[PDB]
Write a protein that binds this ligand. Structure first.
Ligand code: GDP
Ligand code: MG
Length: 165
């Protein structure tokens, strides 16, 4: 297996931990304390060419302080910037995380935007096009809407990354 460090980013409550845990363990946990999610998760996948070990880094709740350590970002091949489609403020802050990620990691980083909790259709505050516009303005690698809870569109986010690595 060749390894790629992939970092989760985005506002508290967006679903970072739940996306990482859905992809790696095919589980979903409700109302978990922000500081208790595993900081480091992994899954090895057979892509075209090769076995790829995703080394997924999660925040351990430290984004509550609105900053993350240089070290978190350093050596990432990829980044998932997660917002909550039910929370317009979370999409505004996604753009802040994209600028921090660009300040701290390689210019070659693959950056993906993910609008999570699409299962909460009644509470939606931002449109698909809101997220697509941000991905266009910031020239990101990809944009998806997903549900960590229903396991809708999570696997695809990570497999599409492989390609670009
Ligand atoms: N309905 C729904 N709730 C979600 C989804 N993903 C996460 N959640 C919930 O949203 C809250 C925050 O999730 P968490 O993964 O801890 O977010 P983080 O702070 O970004 O790591 C938790 O209560 C989760 O159970 C989802 O896709 N849909
Ligand atoms: Mg978390």
């Amino acid at each position: 297996a060749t390894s790629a460090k992939i970092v989760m980013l985005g506002e508290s409550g967006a679903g970072k931990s739940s996306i990482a845990l859905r992809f790696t363990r095919n589980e979903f946990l409700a109302n978990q304390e922000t500081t208790i999610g595993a900081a480091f998760l992994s899954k090895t996948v057979m892509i075209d060419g090769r076995a790829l070990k995703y080394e997924i880094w999660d925040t351990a709740g430290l984004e509550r302080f609105r900053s993350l350590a240089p070290i978190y970002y350093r050596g990432a091949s990829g980044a998932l910037v997660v917002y909550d489609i039910t929370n317009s403020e979370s999409l505004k802050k996604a753009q802040t995380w994209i600028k921090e990620l660009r300040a701290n990691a390689d210019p070659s980083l693959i950056i993906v935007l993910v609008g999570n909790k699409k299962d909460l259709g009644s509470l939606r505050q931002v449109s698909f096009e809101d997220g697509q516009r941000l991905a266009a303005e910031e020239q990101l690698a990809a944009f998806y809407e997903a549900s960590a809870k229903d396991n809708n569109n999570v696997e695809q986010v990570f497999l599409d990354l492989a390609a670009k690595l």
